[PDB]
């Protein structure tokens, strides 16, 4: 409504604003964030590693290294293969195979 | 013949069930605030 100049959520966060000058309606998207989990053979057997970008796209973490927007300031190179889709999210650092 | 293979009862049994969390569907606000 004209009255109306910001909007909350059912807990009582900020999801959109209007624009102070233009009076348009914005929504405010919370920047991807996530845990890390680093997959380890065990110092015993190998140094390699593999790092698991908790509940995020493949693409946006790409777009985040590219942009020097991903916060942890070590990169895991990618080889193409070596970056998988999972649900649980994007894991860099393992070449997915069909065996099961 | 039903995609996932469940069975009439199993499908029965996921349609009931109702998960409303208050986020915004991912295909991986569902993060909260460092809630994940
Ligand atoms: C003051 O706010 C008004 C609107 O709230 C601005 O007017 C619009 O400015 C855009 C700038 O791209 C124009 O395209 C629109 O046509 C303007 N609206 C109208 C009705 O003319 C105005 O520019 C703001 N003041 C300043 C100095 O920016
Ligand atoms: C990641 O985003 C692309 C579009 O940017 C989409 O096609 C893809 O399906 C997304 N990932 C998943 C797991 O759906």
Same mark, same amino acid.
Request: charged content about 15%; aromatic content about 8%.
């Given at each position: 409504?004209?009255?109306?100049?910001?909007? /909350?959520?059912?807990?009582?966060?900020?999801?959109?604003? /209007?624009?102070?000058?233009?009076?348009?309606?914005?929504?405010?998207?919370?920047?991807?964030?996530?845990? #890390?989990? #680093?997959?380890?053979?065990?110092?015993?057997? =190998?140094?390699?590693?593999?790092?698991?970008?908790?509940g995020?796209?493949?693409?946006?973490?790409?777009?985040?290294?590219?942009?020097?927007?991903?916060?942890?300031t070590? /990169?895991?190179? %990618?080889?193409? %293969?070596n970056?998988?889709?999972? /649900?649980?999210?994007?894991?860099?650092?393992?070449?997915?195979?069909?065996? =099961? | =013949?039903?995609?996932?293979?469940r069975?009439?009862?199993?499908?029965?049994?996921?349609?009931?069930?109702?998960?409303?969390?208050?986020?915004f569907?991912?295909?991986?606000?569902?993060?909260?605030n460092?809630?994940?």
């Amino acid at each position: 409504l004209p009255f109306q100049q910001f909007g /909350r959520d059912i807990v009582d966060t900020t999801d959109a604003v /209007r624009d102070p000058q233009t009076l348009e309606i914005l929504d405010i998207t919370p920047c991807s964030f996530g845990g #890390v989990s #680093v997959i380890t053979p065990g110092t015993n057997t =190998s140094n390699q590693v593999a790092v698991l970008y908790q509940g995020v796209n493949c693409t946006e973490v790409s777009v985040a290294i590219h942009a020097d927007q991903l916060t942890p300031t070590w /990169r895991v190179y %990618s080889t193409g %293969s070596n970056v998988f889709q999972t /649900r649980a999210g994007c894991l860099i650092g393992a070449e997915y195979v069909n065996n =099961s | =013949s039903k995609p996932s293979k469940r069975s009439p009862i199993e499908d029965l049994l996921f349609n009931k069930v109702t998960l409303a969390d208050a986020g915004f569907i991912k295909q991986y606000a569902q993060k909260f605030n460092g809630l994940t």
